[PDB]
Amino acid sequence: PRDVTHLLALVSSAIHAVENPFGANDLPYFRTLLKILFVVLRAAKQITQQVLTILDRVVARCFRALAALVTTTAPEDLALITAILQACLSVPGIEQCQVQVLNIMAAHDVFQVAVALFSWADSGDPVYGELALLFLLELSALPALAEHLACDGLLGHLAAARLAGYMRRTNVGPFAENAGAARCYAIWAKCLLPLLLNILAALGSTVAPEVAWVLNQFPNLLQSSVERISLLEISEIHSLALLTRVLAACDVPEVTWDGAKVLECVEYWLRGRKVLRERNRLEEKAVGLLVGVREVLE
């Protein structure tokens, strides 16, 4: 344990020496191993053939082995694996090899297992749902896998899921009462909207029907999104603020949104930077986003 790349191989040499991960006995040690692996990987951002082996024998292995809920495996080590993946794909030298990631991730039945897993989330809250979506979202971060997602038909298997139900019900938003609703929104804000934009970056026109179709299947959220005016709210009116603009420059239904009120809704809550002090950290970066919204949509 001394170099950036050598330190990363031996933790996996330990992660390979594992007997039966997620086994109630040798689980808590496996967790620590994973966390060490994560710490290394996050700080392993300055050889690439090293981070790919764990994308095979760690991420894609455990993500299936863990998908079998059927021991005391929390909905947090799933997040850990999700975060290890996130830690992996951020290595400066994988985008050069994006095609191999898909082969590795598709070798294991990850993509389908994610959608399988996704259905199984629904105490009124979709804990595992947001996770499987964040995972698939982390895959789709790069176009090569988003391509396989759209091609495999994620939106078809997703839009038909009961998860769509609570999102379509007028009881959803950033600031909700019970958890499941707030999380149900958090999914809309943190999964779809950013996931759509990822599958859009793989010849959007072809999949434009799908993204518009799903976007239109959640009208309440759209009608809410404009009449809402936290940061998710801003990212919500930044994704939708670009998901209907691309469609305005390319055989499928249109965007049932009213991006009209938006332009005169940004100027209301921008200039002055005083009224914004009721929702520092949550202004410099926060107010920074809406600078972009009211520039491309003019």
**Resolution value in angstroms:** 3.3
Place of tokens 């949550």: 282
* Measured distance CA(8)–CA(117) in Å, rounded: 29
Which of 163, 156, 131 has its CA nearest to residue 67?
131
Query: Can you list the alpha helix ranges (DSSP code H) found in the chain?
Result: 6-16, 27-42, 48-54, 60-65, 77-89, 98-107, 110-119, 127-139, 143-152, 154-159, 163-167, 179-187, 193-200, 204-216, 219-227, 231-243, 260-266, 281-284, 286-296
How many other CB atoms are found less than 10 A from the CB of residue 295? Answer: 10
CA distance linking residue 225 with residue 236, whole number of Å: 7
> Tell me, what amino acid is at 226?
V
Contact present, 59 and 85 (Cβ < 8 Å): yes
Sign of CA dihedral 273, 277, 283, 286: negative
Closest CA to 168 of 187, 191, 147, 190: 187
CA distances from 186 to 41, 122, 135, 219, 260 (A): 27, 15, 15, 16, 24
Angstrom distance (rounded) from CA 79 to CA 260: 38
Q: What is the CA radius of gyration of the chain?
A: 20
Helix 127-139 crosses helix 143-152 at what angle (to 10 degrees)?
A: 120
Main-chain phi, psi angles of 218, to 5 degrees: -125, 60
Task: Compute the distance between CA of residue 289 and CA of residue 45 in angstroms, rounded to an integer.
Answer: 26
Measured at the alpha carbon of residue 138, what is the angle toward residues 48 and 283, in degrees to the nearest 5?
110
Measure the CA angle with vertex 106, ends 102 and 109; round to 5°.
150
Amino acid at residue number 259: G
Whole-number Å distance between alpha carbons of 108 and 121: 21
Domain ranges of the chain: 1-298
Residue 125's H or E segment, with its range, is: none
What angle, 0 to 180 degrees and rounded to 10, lies between the N-to-C axes of helices 127-139 and 110-119? 160
Name the method of structure determination. X-ray
